[PDB]
Amino acid sequence: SGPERITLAMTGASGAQYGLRLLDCLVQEEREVHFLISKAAQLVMATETDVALPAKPQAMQAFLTEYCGAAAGQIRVFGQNDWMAPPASGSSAPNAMVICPCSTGTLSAVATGACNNLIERAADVALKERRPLVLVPREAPFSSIHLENMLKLSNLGAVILPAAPGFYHQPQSVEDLVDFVVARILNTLGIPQDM
Amino acid sequence: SGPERITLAMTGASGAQYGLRLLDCLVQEEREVHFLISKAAQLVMATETDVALPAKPQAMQAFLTEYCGAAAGQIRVFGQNDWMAPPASGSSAPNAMVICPCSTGTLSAVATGACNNLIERAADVALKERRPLVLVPREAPFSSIHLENMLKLSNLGAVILPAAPGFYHQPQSVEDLVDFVVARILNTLGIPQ
Amino acid sequence: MSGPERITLAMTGASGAQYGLRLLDCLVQEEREVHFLISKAAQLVMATETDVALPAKPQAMQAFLTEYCGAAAGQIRVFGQNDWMAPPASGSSAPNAMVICPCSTGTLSAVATGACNNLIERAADVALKERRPLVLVPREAPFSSIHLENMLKLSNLGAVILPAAPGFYHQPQSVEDLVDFVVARILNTLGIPQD
Amino acid sequence: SGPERITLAMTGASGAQYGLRLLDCLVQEEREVHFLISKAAQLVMATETDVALPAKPQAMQAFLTEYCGAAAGQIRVFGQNDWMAPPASGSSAPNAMVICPCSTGTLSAVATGACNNLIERAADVALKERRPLVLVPREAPFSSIHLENMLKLSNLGAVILPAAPGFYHQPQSVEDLVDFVVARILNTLGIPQDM
Amino acid sequence: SGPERITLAMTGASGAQYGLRLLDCLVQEEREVHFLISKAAQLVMATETDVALPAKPQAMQAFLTEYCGAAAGQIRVFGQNDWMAPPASGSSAPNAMVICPCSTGTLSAVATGACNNLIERAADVALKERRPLVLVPREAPFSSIHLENMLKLSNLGAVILPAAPGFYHQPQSVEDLVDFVVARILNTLGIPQDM
Amino acid sequence: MSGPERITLAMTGASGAQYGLRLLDCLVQEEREVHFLISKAAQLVMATETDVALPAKPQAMQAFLTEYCGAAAGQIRVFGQNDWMAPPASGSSAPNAMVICPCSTGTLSAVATGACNNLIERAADVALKERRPLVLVPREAPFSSIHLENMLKLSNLGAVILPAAPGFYHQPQSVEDLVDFVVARILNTLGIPQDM
Amino acid sequence: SGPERITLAMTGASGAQYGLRLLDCLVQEEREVHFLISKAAQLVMATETDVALPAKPQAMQAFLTEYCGAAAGQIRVFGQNDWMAPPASGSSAPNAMVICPCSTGTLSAVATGACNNLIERAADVALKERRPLVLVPREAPFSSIHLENMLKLSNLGAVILPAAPGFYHQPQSVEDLVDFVVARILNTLGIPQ
Amino acid sequence: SGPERITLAMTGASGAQYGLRLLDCLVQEEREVHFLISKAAQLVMATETDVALPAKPQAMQAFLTEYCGAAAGQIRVFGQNDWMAPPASGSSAPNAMVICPCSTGTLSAVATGACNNLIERAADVALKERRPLVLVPREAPFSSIHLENMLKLSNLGAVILPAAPGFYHQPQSVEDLVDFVVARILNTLGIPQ
Numbered sequence A, D, E: 001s002g003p004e005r006i007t008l009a010m011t012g013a014s015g016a017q018y019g020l021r022l023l024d025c026l027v028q029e030e031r032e033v034h035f036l037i038s039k040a041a042q043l044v045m046a047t048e049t050d051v052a053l054p055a056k057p058q059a060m061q062a063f064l065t066e067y068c069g070a071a072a073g074q075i076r077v078f079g080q081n082d083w084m085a086p087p088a089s090g091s092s093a094p095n096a097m098v099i100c101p102c103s104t105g106t107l108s109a110v111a112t113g114a115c116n117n118l119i120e121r122a123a124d125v126a127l128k129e130r131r132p133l134v135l136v137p138r139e140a141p142f143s144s145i146h147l148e149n150m151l152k153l154s155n156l157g158a159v160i161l162p163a164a165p166g167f168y169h170q171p172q173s174v175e176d177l178v179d180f181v182v183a184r185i186l187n188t189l190g191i192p193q194d195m
Numbered sequence B, G, H: 001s002g003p004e005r006i007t008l009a010m011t012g013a014s015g016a017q018y019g020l021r022l023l024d025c026l027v028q029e030e031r032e033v034h035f036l037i038s039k040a041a042q043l044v045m046a047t048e049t050d051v052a053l054p055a056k057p058q059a060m061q062a063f064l065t066e067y068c069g070a071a072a073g074q075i076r077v078f079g080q081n082d083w084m085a086p087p088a089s090g091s092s093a094p095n096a097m098v099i100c101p102c103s104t105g106t107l108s109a110v111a112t113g114a115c116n117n118l119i120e121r122a123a124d125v126a127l128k129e130r131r132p133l134v135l136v137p138r139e140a141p142f143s144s145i146h147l148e149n150m151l152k153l154s155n156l157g158a159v160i161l162p163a164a165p166g167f168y169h170q171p172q173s174v175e176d177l178v179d180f181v182v183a184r185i186l187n188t189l190g191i192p193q
Numbered sequence C: 001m002s003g004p005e006r007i008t009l010a011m012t013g014a015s016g017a018q019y020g021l022r023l024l025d026c027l028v029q030e031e032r033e034v035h036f037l038i039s040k041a042a043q044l045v046m047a048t049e050t051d052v053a054l055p056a057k058p059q060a061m062q063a064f065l066t067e068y069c070g071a072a073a074g075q076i077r078v079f080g081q082n083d084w085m086a087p088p089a090s091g092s093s094a095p096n097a098m099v100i101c102p103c104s105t106g107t108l109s110a111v112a113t114g115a116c117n118n119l120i121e122r123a124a125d126v127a128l129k130e131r132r133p134l135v136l137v138p139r140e141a142p143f144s145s146i147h148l149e150n151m152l153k154l155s156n157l158g159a160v161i162l163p164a165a166p167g168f169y170h171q172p173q174s175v176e177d178l179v180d181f182v183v184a185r186i187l188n189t190l191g192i193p194q195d
Numbered sequence F: 001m002s003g004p005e006r007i008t009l010a011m012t013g014a015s016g017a018q019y020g021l022r023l024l025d026c027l028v029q030e031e032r033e034v035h036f037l038i039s040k041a042a043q044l045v046m047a048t049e050t051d052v053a054l055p056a057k058p059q060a061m062q063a064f065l066t067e068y069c070g071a072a073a074g075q076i077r078v079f080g081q082n083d084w085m086a087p088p089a090s091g092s093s094a095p096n097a098m099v100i101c102p103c104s105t106g107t108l109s110a111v112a113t114g115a116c117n118n119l120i121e122r123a124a125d126v127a128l129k130e131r132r133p134l135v136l137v138p139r140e141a142p143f144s145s146i147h148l149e150n151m152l153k154l155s156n157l158g159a160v161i162l163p164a165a166p167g168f169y170h171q172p173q174s175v176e177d178l179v180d181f182v183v184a185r186i187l188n189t190l191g192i193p194q195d196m
């Protein structure tokens, strides 16, 4: 149930634990994850978390495999200019893509179709193939430029799922609020939530 | 610095801690608060927090005054159909209004101008007087209907400030994330801390 | 089983209560769980157009409809118009499909604007944000531009505008044949067999 | 009271009983009817009804006069390419036009101004002369293409009256539902109703 | 996997080899094909290929069955005015439709909802049923009218797949470029590309 | 002689490098001055799809392309992606026409929004503000609504959207026949003869 | 009177003298300036003026401090990828921003919200905080793409102040025409002369 | 090369030197110029320049002929209500038109089609005949009203060439900046320098 392969992209918005928690749940659900991360997102993760993420893909692939307890080849990391990567072509891309968190800059590039890196190209491919594309922005306030880009992508089928956790399950910690959004993302993708 | 009188409206979106914390900070900054709350918001607050507000405005005004340690007359509560309340007319309304949290239904009514209660009429008055109007929605995902209503109000001058706390100050508790959004609301209003 | 397991069926104050009752009956015989909602105006419509004595409060209404359709225990669930704890009010718990049959012009407007003033309008707002099937069955003549604009906007967002306009190419002999035509299209739109 | 000359066009939408019943009431109300019918509507009438309609206008005029009990010359039938017919020119056209039923193709042609036959040209003339134009579509569901065509024409003054009969007069027959829509059409035209 | 019944329409754009190759692949995948072809497309196939396609539907069905080695009844050909054909109604139409190649005229008619023939009506039905509709245009340059009609249909859920083959598999023949587009069509429909 | 004397030919990272190489060859045989631009992604596409070993640096690239097409001295001029002093970057010095072939969806987006992040996008922006012919040759399937919206906006402003969609009504026998079809349409759009 | 801290960004449009003259006037008005400059704007300044700025921010800060005679810490230069710089976040950014001159590319990125460097991110922050954002484009002719981006930013509150000096004070030198535009920028910001 | 006859209209925007310099270069390029000037532009020229322009057309034609050294009949001046003038009809109008400088009012009238004087009617004729129409506005800041009028006209084929001179040719005088804009107008029209 749900997509077997998911492209997980992390961009330079605040909330790196949303993406790390989502990656861990996708691994526990035994899904193949094509992991992409921007240069700004690597700076965010080093600023907000105690996760020492390696810079190059191969070292990053081995780190995240140990960090999540993933099986061999379950996590695949690709550089930001690796156009030969599966997510860059329609016939080879995973059946679903999540950008979590999604910076306002990546939200702008996906809305305009800039395709300046692998993350933006993979989102452009998901839209032209009409595959699930979930964007998780973190920004306050939302400008009209942010809202216009979100509305345009939402009108085209993309799911605008902001990092706005709810409080109606009486959260006790920061991780409870992170798990709220992550479960919302798995719910949108059609993947069970074994928290 | 900042508005002396603020209309604080709470509607039936999740995140009643945001509005309670914002009310407390406005009281600590010695601002006069015209407090409004919807029926659905009262149930949200009783569901998510330990605060069950008295229903009638006078008993609700005494509760919030004790809850926040406010001075006499600093917090003024008005019913949802009290059109004689200050926030309902342009000449008497407080010069700033915040809907925190702002449900998708209240976001709908403000965008269309429904004015079916005092909260929606007060937001309509704030727009026609071109006074600060801060909306704090809590919803995931945002549908195109939600985004269209936010974009229209954003284009008209309202500040769309979603309940999306940041993590770049390394929060350690739920209260740190609530304080993140409340601090952004006060900065939007021009109020210290 | 093919199609939605659980369906939110909302009846609003448009004429054509026979459409909603016949649809509820067919959904029960196809062994679907139905979360039944009804407005105050629709209760007055059913008392005016039909001889069905529908109880006013939910618990008595649930027992009446269970006996009316011959449903199993718990197959039909009735919720009040302000029951925000009902499953259809939240995305995580809502049924995976919703039908508003019949759909008044007032409910059509509220769903198009997102008013969320009752459980019916909030459930439709949830179905749109979760991108789940939302079928609207309006009954009105003529269609003003306000009606058509609200229908077009919801049609552009993925909702299915299925007006109560039965066809005659199966040579109907009774009013029930025309009622069954519209109900058959609703079940076909949802992906549910029709006998 | 009301227009004394009516252009009645039938196009290939289901519900030929609506058009035949409307023609019958217009004859009973002593109105002159300029009757037009498309090739697809002739196939619909033969499929849905037991009415054996002749193919070309002169025989069709004598049949409809006998079928409706009309006076001599009360009904005038014109071919689909008779550009010399009154409804094709502004000075000579009847000052009211009804397309009942109105197919999605005719609804599209009127909205775009195709003027490919006498029916579409007559509707184009009615719009440029600011004369009443009533369109009775029969389709379910309404696509966004259908709704935008209806919205554009309704914004221009045309009346979009879908074949959506009401049930608040407690109908007991198919003919009761047909008379509901016909009565609304006459009500829109300002013509009295008399069952 | 994928739809079992396909409506394959060929219109008067250049690239008849695309449609013939797609028909052959759909047959090899054991899919039932409802084949439609316009008069202009018949002239295109006679001009670009040496396939002698019979004009009448019954002889065309026997030819295409022998041309692709299809089973009995696997290919069903319907005339351009056969409104009784399955693709003309929502209840009976195949669950997916492809127009390959798609003329600028057919692209125009589908965008406006002209429904002047079976091909245009079947596409209009696919849109109101929200079933897959893949359009394969062949035109250069694309005018603003072409792009506006493509954008409107793409915004409604139709897949605009232009006959623009890629070269990144290093093609050696014209057939390699034809297979590139056909493979993209099958992948869009969710059908394997074993062949 | 008819048509523009100087043409800016830009190749971006869309599939179909044979289209641009064939167009450059035809413009050279028609004795046109070509200001050749190429993106880093297009250099990867050419190395992947063709057996053409294109040098990376501009001056070594200009010598290779001059010998590849048999051009005269100075007929082909190659400029780096950040060479803002290049003629195509300014309205007074830019060539009379510009062709982006092939045109990636990213370059199509940057021209539609006016990003001007490299010389190719800046040259296209200059061609639009001077109202000079701008031909875009996209290669993508399917076309998303984002692609179509960017194409419609540029087409509405005067740019020629010429997709890499070759026709079959001349009964082609090879891949190059289909490549020559698209190139001939580009030359017809520019007003240049096609005695290829 | 006027903002005490201003973000001054220079992008690769012609007219580097406008930004240098504006930076000088802001320094003489005792304002704190968060100076940002693009790679292309450095090439423009070296082409049109006698000023070739040191590339790194620290050496550029000392050069501009000596060039304008600024006090210690009055001018602060930040790199194009310094996301920790004050202008990149709403709570810490200066309350006014000027992009002078403003390239057609930066005008494009601010209109779409590209946020690809610190300059474009700072302008995006200024718009979401509803703070003064002044864009000074230099281009001729204006294409419809340029005008569409300017109209969108103008409709959102940004001030489109093109480098189009007037002649009604009868200028006698290039410096008089530069001072015309700089005077209008300061008047737009509420800063005297 | 380029149009043989050009309609040159001067309206009440600042920058009369642009129009006078453009008229001079069109004469040196042996072009026939149909010169039009608004009453507001006559006041701008008297304010910004030392050029004593006569008020009525025939004396204005003789002055401009001697000011530019034009041949006999090369410059033809027409009044603001001379509807029989060549530029007022499509069959008789010159092949190209330039409004330099272009006031915001004339920009508005051309965008709406007011045709209240010969200048506005001539621009309306140029658009309906699809002939080159160059507008040179001088205004700062550009309001959204100005930008919307410019965008509509540019979408219709008109060239919006603002009086924004560049500095990349290192100008040494006001005349160098004037010559920059004039050179771009001539290059837009297809006329050499």
Ligand SMILES: CC(C)=CCC/C(C)=C/CN1c2cc(C)c(C)cc2N(C[C@H](O)[C@H](O)[C@H](O)COP(=O)(O)O)c2[nH]c(=O)[nH]c(=O)c21
Residues within 6 Å of the ligand: A010, A011, A012, A013, A014, A038, A039, A040, A041, A043, A044, A047, A102, A103, A104, A105, A106, A138, A139, B166, B168, B169, G083, G084, G088, G089, G115, G116, G117, G121
């Ligand atoms: C003292 C501290 C820690 C201060 C932090 C101040 C800010 C800006 C906080 C919020 N925050 C943020 C935090 C941090 C640590 C960094 C490095 C960057 C951001 N940015 C800016 C983007 O990265 C920038 O726009 C890239 O250009 C995107 O590139 P890409 O799309 O990833 O390729 C951002 N963006 C967005 O949208 N929402 C956001 O909350 C933030």
Ligand SMILES: CC(C)=CCC/C(C)=C/CN1c2cc(C)c(C)cc2N(C[C@H](O)[C@H](O)[C@H](O)COP(=O)(O)O)c2[nH]c(=O)[nH]c(=O)c21
Residues within 6 Å of the ligand: C167, C169, C170, D010, D011, D012, D013, D014, D038, D039, D040, D041, D043, D044, D047, D102, D103, D104, D105, D106, D138, D139, E083, E084, E088, E089, E115, E116, E117, E121
């Ligand atoms: C086995 C059976 C009974 C099959 C019938 C299946 C269908 C499609 C039923 C509904 N139905 C219908 C019925 C019949 C009998 C025919 C011949 C045609 C239609 N069509 C198609 C149009 O005629 C077509 O689109 C012409 O091209 C319009 O031409 P024109 O405007 O009249 O000139 C239609 N259209 C529309 O809108 N609503 C509608 O309910 C129907």
Ligand SMILES: CC(C)=CCC/C(C)=C\CN1c2cc(C)c(C)cc2N(C[C@H](O)[C@H](O)[C@H](O)COP(=O)(O)O)c2[nH]c(=O)[nH]c(=O)c21
Residues within 6 Å of the ligand: A166, A168, A169, B010, B011, B012, B013, B014, B038, B039, B040, B041, B043, B044, B047, B102, B103, B104, B105, B106, B138, B139, C084, C085, C089, C090, C116, C117, C118, C122
């Ligand atoms: C413990 C459980 C199971 C709780 C259910 C949680 C649900 C259903 C959603 C979260 N949540 C929410 C929580 C609770 C407790 C209640 C009572 C209501 C809401 N609603 C619905 C609105 O109140 C409704 O739409 C009123 O009609 C608005 O009226 P008003 O504008 O205030 O006057 C809501 N709305 C919105 O936007 N974002 C939101 O997160 C929520």
Ligand SMILES: Cc1cc2nc3c(=O)[nH]c(=O)nc-3n(C[C@H](O)[C@H](O)[C@H](O)COP(=O)(O)O)c2cc1C
Residues within 6 Å of the ligand: C011, C012, C013, C014, C015, C039, C040, C041, C042, C044, C045, C048, C103, C104, C105, C106, C107, C108, C139, C140, D166, D168
């Ligand atoms: C007997 C009866 C028949 C009605 N018929 C219609 C109808 O056909 N269509 C419609 O839109 N409204 C109809 N209405 C009016 C609606 O009920 C009314 O607008 C109401 O406000 C709808 O509220 P709801 O959307 O909560 O049901 C009818 C009302 C009654 C009592």
Ligand SMILES: Cc1cc2nc3c(=O)[nH]c(=O)nc-3n(C[C@H](O)[C@H](O)[C@H](O)COP(=O)(O)O)c2cc1C
Residues within 6 Å of the ligand: E010, E011, E012, E013, E014, E038, E039, E040, E041, E043, E044, E047, E102, E103, E104, E105, E106, E138, E139, F167, F169
């Ligand atoms: C040999 C031939 C090739 C054609 N090529 C194209 C083409 O590539 N694209 C296109 O849009 N039309 C092309 N046309 C024109 C269309 O056939 C024409 O517009 C026709 O009206 C389409 O009708 P249809 O949509 O019913 O097929 C071609 C026609 C012929 C005879």
Ligand SMILES: Cc1cc2nc3c(=O)[nH]c(=O)nc-3n(C[C@H](O)[C@H](O)[C@H](O)COP(=O)(O)O)c2cc1C
Residues within 6 Å of the ligand: A083, A084, A115, A116, A117, A121, E166, E168, F011, F012, F013, F014, F015, F039, F040, F041, F042, F044, F045, F048, F103, F104, F105, F106, F107, F108, F139, F140
């Ligand atoms: C071998 C290869 C083939 C590609 N095919 C296409 C294509 O057909 N269309 C497209 O838009 N992009 C294609 N891409 C992706 C683009 O190169 C990518 O979007 C890049 O960002 C474009 O940058 P540019 O516009 O500067 O060339 C391809 C890339 C590679 C390496």
Ligand SMILES: Cc1cc2nc3c(=O)[nH]c(=O)nc-3n(C[C@H](O)[C@H](O)[C@H](O)COP(=O)(O)O)c2cc1C
Residues within 6 Å of the ligand: F084, F085, F116, F117, F118, F122, G010, G011, G012, G013, G014, G015, G038, G039, G040, G041, G043, G044, G047, G102, G103, G104, G105, G106, G138, G139, H166, H168
């Ligand atoms: C000397 C020089 C002068 C330039 N003049 C202009 C100009 O007047 N207007 C403009 O929009 N771009 C001009 N450009 C081009 C821009 O620098 C180029 O588009 C660049 O990508 C802008 O990058 P930025 O927005 O990061 O500064 C000029 C470039 C150079 C090197």
Ligand SMILES: Cc1cc2nc3c(=O)[nH]c(=O)nc-3n(C[C@H](O)[C@H](O)[C@H](O)COP(=O)(O)O)c2cc1C
Residues within 6 Å of the ligand: G166, G168, H010, H011, H012, H013, H014, H015, H038, H039, H040, H041, H043, H044, H047, H102, H103, H104, H105, H106, H107, H138, H139
């Ligand atoms: C000395 C002077 C300078 C002016 N400067 C400008 C200017 O720079 N831009 C502008 O749009 N209008 C300017 N105006 C105002 C216009 O002249 C005024 O709007 C007038 O109505 C324009 O009329 P016209 O379009 O018929 O010339 C100026 C006026 C005067 C007298």
Ligand SMILES: CC(C)=CCC/C(C)=C/COP(=O)(O)O
Residues within 6 Å of the ligand: B083, B084, B088, B089, B090, B091
């Ligand atoms: C004590 C009284 C009479 C109060 C008046 C109440 C209202 C809503 C006045 C309208 O105010 P406005 O004109 O819309 O701003």
Ligand SMILES: CC(C)=CCC/C(C)=C/COP(=O)(O)O
Residues within 6 Å of the ligand: D083, D084, D088, D089, D090, D091
């Ligand atoms: C011999 C005659 C009377 C021919 C008239 C036929 C038509 C359709 C004229 C156009 O009429 P209009 O000007 O568009 O209203």
Ligand SMILES: CC(C)=CCC/C(C)=C/COP(=O)(O)O
Residues within 6 Å of the ligand: F084, F085, F089, F090, F091, F092, F126, G047, G139, G140, H166, H168
């Ligand atoms: C020293 C040199 C060659 C400077 C030219 C640099 C540029 C790109 C000028 C822009 O020109 P434009 O006015 O925008 O058309």
Ligand SMILES: CC(C)=CCC/C(C)=C\COP(=O)(O)O
Residues within 6 Å of the ligand: A083, A084, A085, A088, A089, A090, A091, A125, E166, E168, E169, F015, F140, F141
């Ligand atoms: C041999 C390889 C790795 C080719 C990669 C192809 C790419 C990057 C895009 C084409 O894919 P699409 O046609 O746009 O879906």
Ligand SMILES: CC(C)=CCC/C(C)=C\COP(=O)(O)O
Residues within 6 Å of the ligand: H083, H084, H088, H089, H090, H091
């Ligand atoms: C007697 C004469 C020559 C009068 C001049 C004609 C005018 C002023 C406009 C007609 O011109 P147009 O038809 O609109 O292009």
Ligand code: NA
Residues within 6 Å of the ligand: A114, A115, A116, F106, F107, F110
């Ligand atoms: Na790019």
Ligand code: NA
Residues within 6 Å of the ligand: B105, B106, B109, C115, C116, C117
């Ligand atoms: Na409400």
Ligand code: NA
Residues within 6 Å of the ligand: D105, D106, D109, E114, E115, E116
């Ligand atoms: Na038709």
